[PDB]
């Protein structure tokens, strides 16, 4: 459905403010200032590094409706495209950014609860670009958006395919022979469960990228996480199997975490979690309220 596209023209917008960038190109907040009205209704806008060819203009576009076709509480949807001398991706602006800062900036003031039901959410829009036979290629906790701290989702996808390679990430014939499957995209969640779980260390520290396919290959893999118990640490290794089609599907994915999230200190050892839970039903529908209005799916929440 080309609908879900809108073609903007550059005198509609504007961009005010760098929110971060990576390898594709840089992220502004932006104003959209709608059809003869006065109003300017904040955005986020990826422009992207190297200027478009009119030729390769089809080729963006194409994908492009693929990207704005994506329909999931847990997946961004592409909202609108411009093309000029540059290819500008218009999206949602989140006032609250990435799941890798947000875990960062709250380090260790973060309750189990939290971190086993992203786990959860990040699963099921994975699942829902499987079901959809599409394949992410740079999940990572810095592509994943917190739209409120109790809604993630994913964001980023469509560009890897569409044009700094994120080695680390990367599944092992993702890194040698250049293969991307759902399978290698599981790899890449497994990397990012274990970036929300050390709440935001970077993975192999201090380790060249080059060596890592040895690494890998001599059977070494991500540290065990200190609040991980061994199950949730299993589940991160699994991910990581030579064996592609021997690593979890997100459909069980899904199901083991939403299970941990019902008995959540049985899984995750988090210094003074009693003193964190989820919101109470009145702090979330205030949120849903000013912020997040769209339909979802409910958090899985502790049997006791
Ligand atoms: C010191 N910090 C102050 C606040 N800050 C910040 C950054 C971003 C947001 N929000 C926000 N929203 C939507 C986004 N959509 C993409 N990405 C995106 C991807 C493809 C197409 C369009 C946008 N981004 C990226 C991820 C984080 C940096 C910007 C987005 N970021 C809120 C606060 C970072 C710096």
Same mark, same amino acid.
């Given at each position: 459905n080309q609908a879900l596209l809108r073609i903007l023209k550059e005198t509609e917008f504007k961009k005010i403010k760098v929110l971060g960038s990576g390898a594709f190109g840089t992220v502004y907040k932006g104003l959209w200032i709608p059809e003869g009205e006065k109003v300017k209704i904040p955005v986020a806008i990826k422009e992207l590094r190297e200027a478009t060819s009119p030729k390769a203009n089809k080729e963006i576009l194409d994908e492009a409706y693929v990207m704005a076709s994506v329909?999931?509480?847990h997946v961004c949807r592409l909202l609108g495209i411009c093309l000029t001398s540059t290819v500008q991706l218009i999206m949602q602006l989140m006032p609250f950014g990435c799941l890798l800062d947000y875990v960062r900036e709250h380090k260790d003031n973060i309750g189990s609860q939290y971190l086993l039901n992203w786990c959860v959410q990040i699963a099921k829009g994975m699942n829902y670009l499987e079901d959809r036979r599409?394949? =992410?290629?740079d999940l990572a906790a810095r592509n994943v958006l917190v739209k409120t701290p109790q809604h993630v989702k994913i964001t980023d996808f469509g560009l890897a395919k569409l044009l700094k390679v994120p080695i680390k990430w990367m599944a092992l014939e993702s890194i040698l022979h250049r293969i991307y499957t759902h399978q290698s995209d599981v790899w890449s969640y497994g990397v990012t469960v274990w970036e929300l779980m050390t709440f935001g260390s970077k993975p192999?520290?201090? +380790?060249?990228?080059?060596e890592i396919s040895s690494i890998l290959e001599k059977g070494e893999r991500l540290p065990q996480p200190p609040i991980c118990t061994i199950d949730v640490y299993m589940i991160m290794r699994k991910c990581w199997? +030579?064996?592609?089609?021997s690593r979890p599907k997100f459909r069980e994915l899904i199901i083991e975490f939403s299970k941990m999230a019902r008995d959540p200190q049985r899984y995750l050892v988090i210094q003074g979690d009693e003193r964190? =839970?989820?919101?109470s039903p009145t702090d979330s529908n205030f949120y849903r309220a000013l912020m997040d209005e769209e339909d979802m799916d409910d958090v899985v929440d502790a049997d006791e």
């Open positions: 329909d999931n509480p599409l394949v =992410h290629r192999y520290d201090g +380790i060249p990228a080059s199997m +030579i064996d592609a089609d964190m =839970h989820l919101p």
